[PDB]
Structure formats: structure tokens, C-alpha cells
Amino acid sequence: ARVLLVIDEPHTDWAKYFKGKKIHGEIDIKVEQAEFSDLNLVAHANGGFSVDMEVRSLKPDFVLIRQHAFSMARNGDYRSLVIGLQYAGIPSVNSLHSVYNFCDKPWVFAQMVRLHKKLGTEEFPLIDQTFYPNHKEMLSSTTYPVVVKMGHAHSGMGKVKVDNQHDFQDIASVVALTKTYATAEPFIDAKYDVRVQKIGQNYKAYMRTWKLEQIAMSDRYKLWVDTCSEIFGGLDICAVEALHGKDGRDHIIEVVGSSMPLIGDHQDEDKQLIVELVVNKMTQA
Amino acid sequence: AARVLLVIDEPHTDWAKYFKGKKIHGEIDIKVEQAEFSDLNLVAHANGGFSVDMEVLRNGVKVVRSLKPDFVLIRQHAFSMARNGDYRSLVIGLQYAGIPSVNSLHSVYNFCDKPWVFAQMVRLHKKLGTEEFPLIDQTFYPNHKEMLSSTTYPVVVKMGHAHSGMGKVKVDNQHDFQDIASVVALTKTYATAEPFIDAKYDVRVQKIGQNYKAYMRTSVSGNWKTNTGSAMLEQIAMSDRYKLWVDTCSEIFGGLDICAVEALHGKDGRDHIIEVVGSSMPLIGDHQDEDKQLIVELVVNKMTQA
Amino acid sequence: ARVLLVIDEPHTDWAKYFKGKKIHGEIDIKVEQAEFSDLNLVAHANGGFSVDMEVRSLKPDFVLIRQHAFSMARNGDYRSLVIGLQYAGIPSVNSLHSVYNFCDKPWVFAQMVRLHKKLGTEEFPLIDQTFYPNHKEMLSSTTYPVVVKMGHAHSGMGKVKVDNQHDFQDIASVVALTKTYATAEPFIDAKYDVRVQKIGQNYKAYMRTWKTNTGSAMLEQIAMSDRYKLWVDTCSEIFGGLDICAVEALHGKDGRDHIIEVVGSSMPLIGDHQDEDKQLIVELVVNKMTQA
Amino acid sequence: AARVLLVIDEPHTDWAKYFKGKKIHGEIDIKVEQAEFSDLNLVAHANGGFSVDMEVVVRSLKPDFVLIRQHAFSMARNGDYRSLVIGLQYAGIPSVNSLHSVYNFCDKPWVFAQMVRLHKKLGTEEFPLIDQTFYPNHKEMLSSTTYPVVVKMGHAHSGMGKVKVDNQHDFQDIASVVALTKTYATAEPFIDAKYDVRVQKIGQNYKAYMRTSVSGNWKTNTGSAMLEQIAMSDRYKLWVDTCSEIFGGLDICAVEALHGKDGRDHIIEVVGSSMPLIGDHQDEDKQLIVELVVNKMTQA
Numbered sequence A: 001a002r003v004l005l006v007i008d009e010p011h012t013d014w015a016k017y018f019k020g021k022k023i024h025g026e027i028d029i030k031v032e033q034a035e036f037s038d039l040n041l042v043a044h045a046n047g048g049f050s051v052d053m054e055v056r057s058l059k060p061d062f063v064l065i066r067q068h069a070f071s072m073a074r075n076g077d078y079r080s081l082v083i084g085l086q087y088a089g090i091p092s093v094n095s096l097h098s099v100y101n102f103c104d105k106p107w108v109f110a111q112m113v114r115l116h117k118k119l120g121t122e123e124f125p126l127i128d129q130t131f132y133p134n135h136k137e138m139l140s141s142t143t144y145p146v147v148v149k150m151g152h153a154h155s156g157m158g159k160v161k162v163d164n165q166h167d168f169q170d171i172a173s174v175v176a177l178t179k180t181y182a183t184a185e186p187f188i189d190a191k192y193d194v195r196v197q198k199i200g201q202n203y204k205a206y207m208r209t210w211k212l213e214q215i216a217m218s219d220r221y222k223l224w225v226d227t228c229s230e231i232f233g234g235l236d237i238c239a240v241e242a243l244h245g246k247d248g249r250d251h252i253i254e255v256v257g258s259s260m261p262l263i264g265d266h267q268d269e270d271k272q273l274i275v276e277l278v279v280n281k282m283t284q285a
Numbered sequence B: 001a002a003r004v005l006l007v008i009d010e011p012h013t014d015w016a017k018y019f020k021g022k023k024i025h026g027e028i029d030i031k032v033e034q035a036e037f038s039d040l041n042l043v044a045h046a047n048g049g050f051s052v053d054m055e056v057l058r059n060g061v062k063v064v065r066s067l068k069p070d071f072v073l074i075r076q077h078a079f080s081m082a083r084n085g086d087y088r089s090l091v092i093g094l095q096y097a098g099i100p101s102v103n104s105l106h107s108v109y110n111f112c113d114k115p116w117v118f119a120q121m122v123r124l125h126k127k128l129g130t131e132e133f134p135l136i137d138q139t140f141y142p143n144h145k146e147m148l149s150s151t152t153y154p155v156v157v158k159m160g161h162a163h164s165g166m167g168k169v170k171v172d173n174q175h176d177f178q179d180i181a182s183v184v185a186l187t188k189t190y191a192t193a194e195p196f197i198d199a200k201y202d203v204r205v206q207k208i209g210q211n212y213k214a215y216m217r218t219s220v221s222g223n224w225k226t227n228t229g230s231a232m233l234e235q236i237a238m239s240d241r242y243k244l245w246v247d248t249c250s251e252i253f254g255g256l257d258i259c260a261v262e263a264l265h266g267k268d269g270r271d272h273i274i275e276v277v278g279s280s281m282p283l284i285g286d287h288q289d290e291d292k293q294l295i296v297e298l299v300v301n302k303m304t305q306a
Numbered sequence C: 001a002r003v004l005l006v007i008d009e010p011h012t013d014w015a016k017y018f019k020g021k022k023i024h025g026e027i028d029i030k031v032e033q034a035e036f037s038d039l040n041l042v043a044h045a046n047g048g049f050s051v052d053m054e055v056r057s058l059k060p061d062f063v064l065i066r067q068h069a070f071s072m073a074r075n076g077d078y079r080s081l082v083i084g085l086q087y088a089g090i091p092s093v094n095s096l097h098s099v100y101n102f103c104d105k106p107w108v109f110a111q112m113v114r115l116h117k118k119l120g121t122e123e124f125p126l127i128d129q130t131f132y133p134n135h136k137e138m139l140s141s142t143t144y145p146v147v148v149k150m151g152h153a154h155s156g157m158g159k160v161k162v163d164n165q166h167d168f169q170d171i172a173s174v175v176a177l178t179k180t181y182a183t184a185e186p187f188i189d190a191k192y193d194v195r196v197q198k199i200g201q202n203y204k205a206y207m208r209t210w211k212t213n214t215g216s217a218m219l220e221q222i223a224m225s226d227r228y229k230l231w232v233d234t235c236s237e238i239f240g241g242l243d244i245c246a247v248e249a250l251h252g253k254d255g256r257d258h259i260i261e262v263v264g265s266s267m268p269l270i271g272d273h274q275d276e277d278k279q280l281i282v283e284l285v286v287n288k289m290t291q292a
Numbered sequence D: 001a002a003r004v005l006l007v008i009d010e011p012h013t014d015w016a017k018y019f020k021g022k023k024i025h026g027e028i029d030i031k032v033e034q035a036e037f038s039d040l041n042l043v044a045h046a047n048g049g050f051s052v053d054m055e056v057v058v059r060s061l062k063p064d065f066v067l068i069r070q071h072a073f074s075m076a077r078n079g080d081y082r083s084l085v086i087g088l089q090y091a092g093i094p095s096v097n098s099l100h101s102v103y104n105f106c107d108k109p110w111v112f113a114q115m116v117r118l119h120k121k122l123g124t125e126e127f128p129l130i131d132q133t134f135y136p137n138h139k140e141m142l143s144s145t146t147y148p149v150v151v152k153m154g155h156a157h158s159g160m161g162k163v164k165v166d167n168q169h170d171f172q173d174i175a176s177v178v179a180l181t182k183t184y185a186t187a188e189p190f191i192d193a194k195y196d197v198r199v200q201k202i203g204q205n206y207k208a209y210m211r212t213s214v215s216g217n218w219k220t221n222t223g224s225a226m227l228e229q230i231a232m233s234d235r236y237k238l239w240v241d242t243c244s245e246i247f248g249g250l251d252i253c254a255v256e257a258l259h260g261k262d263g264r265d266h267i268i269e270v271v272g273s274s275m276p277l278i279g280d281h282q283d284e285d286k287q288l289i290v291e292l293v294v295n296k297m298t299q300a
Ligand SMILES: Nc1ncnc2c1ncn2[C@@H]1O[C@H](COP(=O)(O)OP(=O)(O)OP(=O)(O)O)[C@@H](O)[C@H]1O
Pocket: A147, A149, A153, A154, A155, A156, A157, A159, A185, A186, A187, A188, A189, A190, A193, A210, A211, A241, A243, A253, A254
């Protein structure tokens, strides 16, 4: 029986979705589930290794990662477990390589910058964004308001709207206390934001209208996510988020990996899709 | 043999000049060494032995010269949560070596957490009452989790331990407060929130030894932070009111030789004390040269007592 | 009913030890107990405040601190809670001031360095320790072996025996990764080590028979000498006074004593009089609460 | 319009000297700008605009290329320059080694993992990777099968954080120290080495040096030691060739291995473009690096 470790919150019962699924028609799949916070491991270059949960130990043959491997908030650093999993040679979705490299939002943005550079604005409208290695480079902005995003954090954390020079200077003084990097980008007066996802070969576009209706995929939206899905060796599960300004201009602000939240009326379909995806990946091994 | 005095301060002020010709007991000369925290290190032995190492730029070659100070004057902030602003171990080292200081090393170490110092003012306020010691209403949050909301807006949020306006922001509403709380989570430290005061001006009452001065500061750049941007300073008369403020605060942590009390003066006529600073308070106004001389007098007298 | 918050692990049922105890003869005492890791609070300059536990909230009239307030190990920093309690103006044992100042072992040691300078080696034999603000000052050592103690940690953590120059250099390079200070001191070929404790006005001395801290060891309560009493009485005066404290010393095979540390109100209770010590602590707390 | 090359290296090597007279496509000049990570900062815009600020006066530049000779990360205070690497990539500035490999080289265990893969593929005979155990944090550090071992704490250089442990009691003391570093660590068999070897590869040039101590230290990079260049073998060529393909390709790299007294080799690490130049051919290596960079610059 093949052991699949799914790093995810307890709500979604992954064992339920993998129930009955078999590799090559007879190799059963056992599902072990737990959050990053309850895991630890030890890996040997020789191949031996063990993942400890809660305390029960297991040896996953594969891993599905649905949780953020890193957050600059307290207790959110799980990079060393990602390193350990890679060290033990365990295959995963998304790839451990992409997971590790997704641990710095500006590092992932840089990849889109390169994409934007090749494709041009009419094909890939990447939002205008500025990167600051530290607060010392934060002096002012061309226009206001702007959205400042501090360090590497999720669910709105560390993201503030700044309406003027004085406030910017204050916010910059706060970046100094985070002792990390930050970005600033034009605040978009949005009519709504859209997220284009891609799981394996399935695509879906959702329209949500400061901080849900499924729409039709377009060739434009497909290009956005197809191009983004190729970074860091390829992302099996990813999505592109863009803001649609009242003036009709689109602005791509981010690309998410395998921890992207499932949304809308089809969360069930998407989980099954992820299951189909992981089963196929496990099959090849 | 000359007594060695180490002054920890930025190079803008040349203390050697101010201590020139000052003698202890009339015949002992004072040799002044000066440097910033960033260029200092030391080693201290329980038996009394010790050495202070100072990095100096002697013509391109980064040279380290060691000294054995008999006394120390601390004019720089020993701690800041900004990168490279943590000099607490040097303060511990100086105390470990038993070096006398101004202000006392004990007070300096205990001044490394603004809310910890503020707690002393809270005690003094419960004791003296609002009429005589109008401490501002402030709330202390050990971490971001307890930052849910405020009774009134706008509020001024002060993150961790920092200076010169660093880490302080004005928040006008509930939604913005929640965003700021999420930022606090990224600083991974404590934070305080206090009522934003529409101030006519702010004032600072200082006490150097037995010399008192009060200054009023007004912004002329539309900065609610009057220490940020150009502003106007006006020295004002000392009052019994101002004197009580700095006298009572000057007694904390065993006694502060150099200290000051900052208060905001509302447009509605109400005063609000927001902080007491130690021996690293910036000299201000048009009497800075006098204050430096007052500090020499104080230090020389403290050195004589040893 | 006065509320007493006891910060300690659950192995000790403080509610039981305080059961029946009343202040002034009629005011009952309500005991709330929890570890630092399960606590949070909010304090206002106006006197308002709340301590949140686990989630249930309380308003302690007094606190007894039995847990280390600071450790450089991950998750061990509770200094902000000690600041909060002081900000809320809550009385404590030991005093919150002393607890805060005990959060840097070398800072505490510095107080003993002064006592030693006043008393003299014959009265107060403080061990020959060296303080390094950071690793850059860690070059060598007069003698070997030495014991290096990194940062601020407990129960033997971060402490290592170093036998030679080269090993010292390697260990110094590790201090660099801790990004904090460290101390070095002569390794004592100890016959045994002793701990002289003082809880209120009750004194006890125990002899324990290289880290007698780690693994199985034997304890023998020994007589208090005036010498021992002097060590703990003087150390008990630092930072405004310690209601609970103990001095640790190493006794070398050559007959010499070496004081290596004074612990505060979170000192572990040891030997066979631990129940009595808890009872002495209860008496102490009740006396303190009565005066408020 | 001369091309700007920013070299991130310490003042010792005068890179401008080595690039003097070199021109792209025959006529385009190359201006060399040099500085250490500590004296650099920058700003990058998604629109392409950007600037590098060097404390020389705070002069600012717009490198057309970058050569990185300095470690981008160290867990010692002030050794974290990862955000500058991210910044350079955000600005889309070509580099040697690739900024991608530089960023991924900021965790020794992450790189070692790559060498684990190659070992699984190649076998001990061709790729004798040392027996190493990775610990995410001090909690899994219970004991060792054999002693003595070498504990390598977190991510650091020049011997920092590396200690020899001769027994269980000492392993536990060191485990408690790791707890204080609040990071990962690895443990590996201590090798009674006759000497240790390093096989380097710069572009298409290979070299192999052997180093042995003479100051009494097991860390032969600490104290007086003797270096001796030796002959390249196909065994060595395989080592550096295989590792040079990781993270999209390493322009400059080397594989370090220990040669036990029992005759066995043990590979312990692969370094990137900030590997120190050793031996009697440092001038030649700096020249090979100039050629490599000139070529890379030519292609852009
Ligand atoms: N530049 C901008 N202009 C206007 N609104 C913005 C901008 N950037 C972000 N927002 C708004 O803030 C929301 C959250 O921003 P962002 O997606 O960066 O946060 P996040 O922490 O990555 O979110 P989550 O983790 O919930 O995916 C966006 O959905 C959008 O509504």
C-alpha cells in the first residue's frame, strides 16, 4: 500500500476523496493527514527516513502540500521540513522545488516580471510593483494611493493601503521593525478581481465582486495561467489573481501555488481533480 | 594617572573639548575616549579585569584600539528593534565589569523597553493622580492577538521599542486598525495604542542634575509627528507643574541623572504625558552647548565620587 | 475573594495548597493556574486589564511566578507578559521587577560580581567567569578545561565543557550562530555541588553528587553554615529583594568553593522537603497578599 | 555605451584589473564596479527601472550584469543578503552563477539534497556521498549510530558552526546548543582523513587540489595547512560534472570530499560561484572567470 502524506487543515477529509483509488489497478493508497504544525522528520542521505506526526511515525511515498510552507508571522516557518522532505527524496505536488521557491513572494513576482518582460503589457498585464530589500530604500511613491505588502505573509496579513507621502514614510518606519523586505504597488480602484486557476489540465475563472461568480475562460486568461504554471519546473496546481479596474484595465498581482484555496460552487470537483492529479503522479513511481 | 572616561555617542559632538582641562579633585586629569555603540565591543572578567575594544578608521585600515574606561557616559540608545540596534549585551558587559556610569547602567538596561518604563509612569500616575501627573491613556498588547479594537479613533499605534518616530503610525478606523494589527504580527513583538491627540504643540521637561528646562515644539510641515520634518522650538518657563513631572520620573530605577518628560498639549487645553527618556535624550533648543557643559559638570562630579 | 494567578506547570496543584487559606481571617483566595505558553493579556494605563488563559479571562489581584520568564530556546520568550503584568500594576512573588531583571543570566551574575568585590573572596567565593558580548571576543582561555555557557537557557541547555584551544574556537564559532552573548569559566573538578535556598526566612542547603544536572544523581540535605547563609542572604537583596532564591556553588576536590549562580522565584524545588517548601511559599504569598 | 558589470566581492581581488582591455563584440567596453554585499542596497520596479546603491558617498549604478563571489547567506549576524539576490532577480539582471542557483544555494542541506539524488542515481562507487543525517530542528537529534560525528549547524562558512562530537553525552549537550540556534543541523560520520580534496570546474576548466593540516586541526581550513594540486581523474570529472548541472546549471562550482585513511572518499559538499580560489593558480582562475563572464555578457 502506497502512503500519501497530505499536509492540510483537518476540514477537508482527503482520505474520503482517495478512498477506493488504486495505482495500476491494485496498489492501494493509504492516506495520512496532518498540518505542518504537527509534523517533524529526520532524513538520511542513505535513504532511511521517518516523518513524525502529532506521536506516530510514517514513511510517505508521496506528499500533497496544501498548506503555506512559510509565513513571517510567529511559528509559520516550515521551510526546514520542506528541505527535509526533499532531502529524503519524497515526490510531491506541487514539486518540493516549487514549494521552496514559493517561500518569498517577491521571488515569485520576479518570475512574473521576467514573463511580463517577454510577453509585454497587452498580453500579460503585470501590475506596476516596486521591490525594497529593506526600509532604507522606501522614500516615496510616484502616485497614491499605493498598497504596501510587508515580508512574506498570507490572508491579508502585512498588507496596508497608503494614501499619502507622510503615511508612506510612517509605514516605511514600520517596515524597519519587520526587518525584512516590502513591496509597493498602485492601489487599483477595482470593479472586481478575477482568479484564473489551473489544476492539471482543468481551468476555471472566478469573478469576485479595500480588501463569487464563475465566468468563462478566455484565450487571454488561459495564457496568463499557462505561462505562470511553467515557473520553477512547473506547478501542477496554481492560479493567477488579477484586479479589473473601473477603467477596464486588468492588473495581475499574484500567482499562487498548491496551497491555493478552492473556491466557488465546484470545490468538490476540484478536490477530485486534485485526487486524479496526485494518483497519476504517484502512478509514475 | 589620568582617569579614562568613555563617552558613547555619535561624532557630531566632540566631548574631549568639553571635558578639556576639567580635573578630578583639582589634580587628576580626564582622558576622553568616544565612540558609537556600533564600533564597540569588550570582554569582562569576574575578577575585575577587562578591556573595551573600539574600532577606529585610521587611514583606511580598520584599527581596533583597546581601553579600560574608569567611567562611562551613555548618550546613545542602547536598544532598538531595528536591524543592528541591539547593544544590550554591551550594557550588560559594562555592568559585569563594574564600570560606573551616567545614567546608571541599571537604569539604561531597564530603559530598553518603552512599555516597561511606561509601567513606572502608570504607578506614579495612580499615586499622584491626573491633575498632577496627566499620563496619557495607553493600552499595552503583549503581542498582536490581543489587538481587537479601540474605544475611540483615531489612535496612535507604537510598535515595539524604537526611536525618532520609528514604528509609530496613526490609525483612523476599525478596518485600518485590523490591518495594522496584522503588521504587528510580522514584527513579532509587543505594541501599544493610545488616543491620537489633536495637539496645539508638545512639550519636553528636562532635568540634568539640578538644572531644569522646558521646550515647546510645533510643526510647520503638516506632520502630526513634530519630530519628523521641520518644526519650531520655543523655550518656555519652568512651572511647579513641569518640575513635579520630571522630579517624580527622575526617581525611577534607582535615580536618573539625565532625563526628560514628553507631554502632548491638546488644543482643548489638556496635557498628556507620553514618555520619560533617559541619558540618551537628544539635546534640543538653543541651549545645547550649555546642556553639554551641564553634563560635563555632572559627570566630573560623579567621577570624583570614586 | 482575592484572585491569585500562579504561573507554573500543572504537576503542582496550587489550588490545593492554598485551599482554606484566607487573608485577614475572612477573605478567601481563589487560585487560577496556568503556564506562560497558555497566557496573554491586555493592560490599560487607567488600571483596566484582563489576563486571558488557554479561552477564559480573569483579573488577578496577585501573581506567583514559578516558571522561567525567558529562554533563548524557540517559544521561550515571555518577557512581554512580565512587562504587561507590571504595566497592569499587579503585585508578585518574586517581584516583577526582579523577574524582568533575571532574564539575562550574566546581568544577574553582574550583581554577584559587585557583592564579591565588596565581601571579598574569603566570604563570597564567586567563580572566575568571563563575559563575551558576542563571539568575536572569544579568542582563547588562560586555562582548560572551561565550561562555556551560551546565552540565557536552563536545565543544562547551551552549556558545554571545552578541553582545549581548538575546541574553544569551534565552540566560539557556534556562539556566532546563536547571535548572542556567552560566558566561559574554569571547569571545576567537583566533589559535589551545593544549593543554598531561601524562601522567606526559611533556609535549606542541599549537596548533589559532569552535569550533575543531567541524569541520575544523589541529594543530601546538609547543615546551613553562617558562610552559606551569608551567600544567600546577600544575593536575596538584589533588584530590590528576592522572596524566593538560591545560590549554587561547586565544591572542588581541592576543598575550594565556587559560586556559579543565583536563581530566582522559578528555582526548582529539590530534595525531600518539596512539599514543605510549597507550603512555605503559600505562607509567603498569603503574607504578601495580606499587605495589599 | 560601455556595459556595466557589478562584481560582488571583497576588496582583495582587483577585478577591474582582470577585465581591463576586455571588450564585448570587439568594440563595446566593460566598466567594472566592485563592492561587498554589506555596502550594497537597491530598488527594483516591475517596469524594468532599477538602481543599485553602493556606499563608496552613496553612488548609484545600473549593472548590465553581475558576478557574485561572496556568500549571499550566513546565519551569523549581518550575513543575510538574500533580499539583495531577490532584488537583483526582480531587476532581471543576468549573473554568474545564475541568481536562481545563488538563491537556492542559501541552505546547505537544500543543496546536499541534490547530491543525495545524484548519489541514489549514480551509486557509491562513482558518487561516494558522505553518510549524512538531516535534522529539521534539535528535537530529532537523539543519538548517533557511531562516534565520533561532526555536527554542522544551520548555514554558515569557513568552519563556523561545525563541531566534532566524540560521545552520546556530548551529542546531547550539542543537541541543546542547536536548540539555541533555533534552526536545522546535520550530523555525519567523522572521517579520519589522510587529507581532503576539492575538484573545481570553471566553465570547461577543471582542477583538483588536496589539503592536509599541519597545525593540529581536523578542520583543515582552520590554521596552517599545505595545499598540493593533483591530477584530474575521470572519477573527479564525473563528480563536478554531475553537480554542475543542478539548479539549471552552475557556471562556477567545486565538489569537496574527504579521503579516509582506509582509502575511501566521502563527498561532503558542492559550492557555487562564491567558492574561494585556492592554490598556485588563483591568477589563472580569475582569468578563466573573466573569460567566462565576458562570454556570458556577450550573449545579451
Ligand atoms: N494593488 C492593489 N490595489 C487594490 N486592491 C488591492 C491591491 N492589492 C491587493 N488588493 C486587494 O486586497 C486583497 C488581498 O490582497 P492579496 O491578494 O495581496 O493578499 P493575500 O494575503 O495574498 O490574500 P490571500 O492569502 O487571502 O490569498 C485583494 O484580493 C484585493 O481585493
